[PDB]
């Protein structure tokens, strides 16, 4: 349970400011009816966001780090998954997933 409390900090610093310019896409659900997307919730069948990471941090809904870590890679996979390489947030996403990526790896 150590091990989650080092999640909740990579949480913290990914919704900081020092990343703020690639990683505001992520802050809240992709509102698809706000955007203009007519086909997002049938191409991705499970939603995710950084906000909804901390709601279930906050809700004790993981049971370890590794639950922590298949929600915030389930969020780029979403972003990969619906948008063409060439996109602009997918190249937020891979900075943003270069971040998470570097501090999930320097966990105990
Ligand atoms: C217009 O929406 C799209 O074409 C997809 C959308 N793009 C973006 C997006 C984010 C940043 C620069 C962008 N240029 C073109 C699209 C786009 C997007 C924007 C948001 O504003 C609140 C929220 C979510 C996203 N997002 C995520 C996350 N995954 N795909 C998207």
Redesign the pocket.
Known sequence: PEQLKHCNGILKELLSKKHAAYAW??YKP?DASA???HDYHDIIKHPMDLSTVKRKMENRDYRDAQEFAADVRLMFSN?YK??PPD???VA?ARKLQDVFEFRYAKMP
């Open positions: 896409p992520f992709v955007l203009g997307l972003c619906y948008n996109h602009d947030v937020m």
